[model samples]
Target: GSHMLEVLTQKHKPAESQQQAAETEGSCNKKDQNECKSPCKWHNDAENKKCTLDKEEAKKVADETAKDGKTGNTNTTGSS
Candidate 1:
């Protein structure tokens, strides 16, 4: 398993729709307006402006990512 945000923040590059979504309703506006919320999401540390596996559950997802080299192994049904 992966952290909710980790799976969302993996290696895939963002599409225009994602970028636009992040700009409008994602995490960007919630913080300093410079940070992204979509692909970046809760993975970022608000104070550091960097990606971090801050949550305890995040480590589990991170481990899964490390093992799988991606978030594909993560749960896809229901929600994170």
Candidate 2:
């Protein structure tokens, strides 16, 4: 199911305006077995309406998200 969605989205990924709309569906904050946020780093904070990650994770996500800014490559598929 996840793979299906990824494949479909990859086929027609939207503009950054829409594509950057990331939300932590589930990973750190969840059930009892996984309730503990041991090494959990990234997640979406609805109260703040933003994605939060650790220094390392933040660097990685930031680099990818803003890599275009550094390269000046405005080649996103869905632009509007």
Candidate 3:
């Protein structure tokens, strides 16, 4: 019998493309949203070491939080 149990999650979408596009556009003198806006779209768990990112969801959450004068913080760990 195994008594060990683990819960994990993984990110579905990443803001890599969005981030690159954002940076490129920003360099082009284009008006862009906050750097954190589309930079970190995925949220990874310290316990599971997995990610949970939904392109629209993350953006939506970030936008909502910002609109409400709130801010979102992204963890500085992940990537292989």
Question: Estimated TM-score per prediction?
Answer: 0.18, 0.25, 0.19
Global lDDT of each candidate: 0.39, 0.37, 0.35
Candidate 1 has a TM-score of 0.18
C-alpha lDDT of residue 55 in model 3: 55
Clashes of each: 3, 0, 2
lDDT of 1: 0.39
Candidate 2, residues 1-80, lDDT tens digits: the string is 14222322232444322233122325434523323222334344566333332445535544664323435445576455
Considering TM-score, which of the candidate structures 1 and 2 is the better prediction for this target?
Answer: 2
Q: Rank the candidate models, highest TM-score first.
A: 2, 3, 1
Q: Please list the Cα RMSD from the true structure of every candidate, rounded to 1 decimal place.
A: 12.4, 12.5, 19.1
lDDT of 3: 0.35
* Candidate number of the best lDDT: 1
**Candidate 2 error regions (>4 Å):** 1-52, 65-80
Q: What residue pairs clash in candidate 2, if any at all?
A: none
lDDT of 1 at 30: 55
Which residue runs does candidate 1 get wrong by more than 4 Å?
1-53, 65-80
Q: Quote the positional error of residue 13 for candidate 1 in Å.
A: 12
Show where candidate 3 strays beyond 4 Å: 1-51, 65-80
